[PDB]
């Protein structure tokens, strides 16, 4: 991966929310040494949000005790007690390896996050897992992780989601250590995902107005929906989460985008979010993949990715995403080429595997219209881009590789108004990996693809008719 996270050795797995500490973000990630085995808090730094400094474990595995997923926080105003600045971190484990033991552990730093102490008492105990006898008892009480922190600032105290099977939980607390059950949520689609890596965070909307959000990953797969990111705007009073609307919208369109984590950008941390998600799926992400042979390791993160919440008709509100601004410092050179109007198909002059490129497309009664990425010479492996319908779809079936296939997940799709005659594109290429940001992104699909050495060329398509390719900008990405 040229521009991609990637651990420097071993499995990669779920990140955690950054901190801002020592000019930069502190980002955590779970890691094992095996893939898919036990494994725990894995530490990594940038300044920029695009390039990262690994400085390997920080929260180790032990006997029969891997950290899971969780979160953490830099406790400003030493309300935990662990001297003022501490970074402090709540981090789901097994308790004596027992499922339906896991709970709540607190770790904190007092070197801006790269050494961690443990604090050997569960800060939030999972009660009802001793208690439970019967087989639906014992699956709840083993659905009790990811803690995720905030700061609430209104009512001045710490505010914490935990994931739970189809609900999600919260607790109060003044200092970190003692928390307070609060109310449930619940939504009404349970066919939707159970909640698993639950996000919480506070943002201002392009018209100054202030709102809360909900979001975790989620697997409707089975309903036709993403298994990717969910969220609901809404409030949160100190007791009770209360959503605009009980249908949670989508972050993400594409087959990899889970167990994403948000956090404050420093340069306007009420306005403006950074993100970045796990480029993986659980139907196959324990498998072998094509790095793994070659390079000891599996696994890389999505590009960060900066949110804003806009304001829609109607008074409702809706997130936005954006490639982070500083991947422009990347760019080692820019090509551009001729607008053109192509029936049926046609070859691009260019040839390459991490880039970025960009276009418009426009039509008329073509039913079908698209982009083809990651084209070896032999025309038969490509990643497709295109509209159909009312889709807006990435399919990167024809890029199965021989011992590594991804299908039956090949076509992936964002909705896009079927009466649209025109699109523009934005479309980040690696050599894992294919990101695509449609429009002023309120629909981004992110998908792993195992490319080949060979597959780097560019194709334009079309179907019914001819359309007319434009502003086609191909930036490279070096290091």
Not at 185 to 205: K, Q, R, S, V
Request: aromatic share 12%; hydrophobic share 35%.
């Amino acid at each position: 991966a040229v521009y991609h996270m990637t651990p420097p050795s071993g499995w990669l797995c779920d990140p955690q929310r950054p901190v801002t500490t020592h000019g930069a973000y502190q980002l955590y990630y779970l890691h094992s040494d095996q893939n898919n085995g036990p494994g725990g808090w894995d530490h990594a730094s940038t300044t920029d949000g695009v390039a990262f400094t690994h400085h390997g474990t920080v929260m180790p595995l032990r006997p029969d005790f891997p950290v899971w997923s969780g979160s953490a926080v830099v406790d400003t105003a030493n309300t935990a007690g662990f001297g003022a600045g501490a970074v402090v971190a709540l981090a789901t484990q097994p308790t004596d390896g027992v499922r339906k033991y896991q709970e709540q552990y607190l770790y904190w730093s007092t070197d801006g996050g790269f050494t961690f102490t443990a604090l050997p008492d569960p800060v939030i105990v999972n009660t009802d897992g001793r208690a439970a006898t019967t087989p639906a008892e014992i699956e709840n009480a083993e659905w009790f992780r990811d803690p995720k922190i905030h700061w609430d600032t209104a009512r001045g105290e710490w505010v914490c989601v935990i994931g739970r099977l189809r609900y999600a939980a919260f607790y109060t607390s003044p200092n970190l250590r003692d928390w307070t059950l609060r109310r449930n949520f619940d939504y009404p689609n349970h066919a939707l995902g159970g909640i698993e890596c639950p996000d919480l965070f506070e943002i201002t909307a392009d018209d100054g107005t202030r709102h809360w959000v909900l979001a975790a990953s989620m697997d409707a797969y089975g309903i036709g929906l993403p298994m990717t990111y969910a969220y609901w705007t809404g409030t949160w009073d100190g007791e009770q989460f209360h959503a605009d609307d009980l249908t949670p919208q989508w972050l993400d369109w594409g087959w990899d985008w889970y167990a994403a984590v948000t956090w404050p950008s420093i340069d306007a941390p009420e306005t403006k979010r950074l993100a970045i998600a796990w480029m993986n799926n659980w139907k196959y992400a324990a498998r072998d993949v094509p790095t793994d042979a070659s390079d000891g390791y599996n696994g890389q993160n999505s590009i960060v990715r900066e949110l804003r919440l806009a304001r829609q008709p109607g008074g409702w509100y809706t997130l936005l995403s954006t490639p982070v601004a500083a991947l422009t410092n990347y760019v080692t050179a820019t090509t551009t080429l001729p607008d053109r109007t192509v029936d049926g198909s046609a070859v691009l002059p260019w040839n390459g595997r991490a880039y970025e490129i960009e276009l418009d497309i426009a039509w008329d009664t073509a039913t079908n219209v698209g982009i083809s990425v990651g084209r070896s010479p032999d025309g038969t492996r490509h990643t497709n881009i295109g509209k159909y319908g009312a889709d807006l779809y990435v399919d990167r079936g024809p890029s199965d590789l021989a011992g590594y296939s991804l299908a039956p997940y090949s076509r992936a799709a964002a909705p896009i108004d079927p009466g649209a005659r025109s699109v523009h594109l934005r479309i980040l290429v690696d050599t894992q990996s294919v990101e695509v940001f449609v429009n002023a992104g309120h629909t981004v699909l992110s998908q792993q693809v195992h490319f080949a050495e060979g597959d780097t060329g560019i194709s334009l398509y079309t179907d019914g008719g001819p359309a007319h390719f434009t502003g086609i900008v191909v930036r490279e990405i070096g290091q």
